[PDB]
Symmetry: C4
Subunit: 93 residues, 4 copies
Amino acid sequence: DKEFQVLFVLTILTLISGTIFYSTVEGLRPIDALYFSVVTLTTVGYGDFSPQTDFGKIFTILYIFIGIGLVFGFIHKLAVNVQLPSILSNLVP
Amino acid sequence: DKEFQVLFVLTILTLISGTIFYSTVEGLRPIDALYFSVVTLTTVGYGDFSPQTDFGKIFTILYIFIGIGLVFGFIHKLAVNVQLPSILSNLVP
Amino acid sequence: DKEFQVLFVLTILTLISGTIFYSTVEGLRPIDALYFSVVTLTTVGYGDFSPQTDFGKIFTILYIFIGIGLVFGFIHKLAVNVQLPSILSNLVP
Amino acid sequence: DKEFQVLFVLTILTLISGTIFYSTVEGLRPIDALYFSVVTLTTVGYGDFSPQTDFGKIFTILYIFIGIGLVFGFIHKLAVNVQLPSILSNLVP
Ligand SMILES: [Ba+2]
Ligand SMILES: [Ba+2]
Ligand SMILES: [Ba+2]
Ligand code: NA
C-alpha cells in the first residue's frame, strides 16, 4: 500500500525524465518519448524508436541501468500487492 | 495445479484482449495481433509489428505494465509446477 | 553440478529444436536459426530475423512460453553454481 | 558495498570486452559498440545494431549467456544495496 505508492511515484518521475530527455535531445513527440521510455525500461525494445545521437545513446545506457530495477520492482509489487489479492477476491465462493 | 489453472486462464484473457485491441485499432490480422501481444508481454519485442497510432501506443504502455507480471508468473509456475516435475520423472532410475 | 548438467542438456535440446524448425519452415541458414532461437528465448529480440509465416508465428508463441523458463533457469544456475564460486576463487587472499 | 563493488568491476570488464569485440569484428564505432553491448545484455535489444557476421553471431550467443546473469545481478544489487536505502533516506521524517 505505502510500498506500492512510493514505487508508483518513483516510476512516474523516471518516465517523466525520459519523456523530457528524448523529446528534447532526440526530437521525439512527447507521447512517443514516453512510449519509448516505457518500451526501453521494460526491456521490450521494439526499436521503432531508438537514439540516433551519441548523447542519446549515453543517456540510454545510464537510463537502463538506473531505471530497470525500479520499473520491475513496481511491476512486481503491482502484481503482488494489487493484482494478486484482487484475483483471489474474484475466486472465494 | 489449481494455481497453474488460474494463471493459464488469466494469461489467456490477457492475450485475447490484446488480440482484439491490436486487430481493431492497429489493423493487424488476428493471428498477427496474438503473436504481437505475446512478443510484447514476454518482452521479446522484435518490432516487426509495433503500434503506429497514439491510441495503440498508450494501450501498449498500460498493457505492458499490467500484463508482464501475469505472463511471467505463468511462465514461472509452468516451469516450476509442470516442467520441473516432468523432467525429474524422466530421470529417476 | 548435476543440476547445471541437466539444465545444460535441456537448453541444448531446446536450441536444437529451434534451429531445426526455423531453418526448415522459415528458410534460415542453420547458424542464423540457432542465433535467432537464442535471441528469442533470452528475450533480446533484435528483430533482424523474425518469423514471416503463420506456422512460424504460432511455433514462436509456443517456443517462447516453453523455452524462456528453461533458458533463464540455466542462465541462473550457470551464474550461481559456476560463475559465482569462480569469481570468489579469484578473490580470497 | 564490497558486493556492489565487485559486481561493478565485473560488469565493466564484460562491457569492455563487448566494446572491443563489436568495434573490431562488426566495425562499430566504440561508443556504438558499448551501447550495443548494453542494449544486448539488458535484453532491450532494439536491433538498430545487430551482428552481420557469423563470428559476430556466435560471439553474441555466448556473450548473452555469460553476461546476462552478471548484468542483472549488478542491476539487482544496485537497486537493493544502493537505490533502496537512498530512497528511504529521503522518506524518514
Ligand atoms: Ba527485447
Ligand atoms: Ba527489437
Ligand atoms: Ba527491431
Ligand atoms: Na527482457
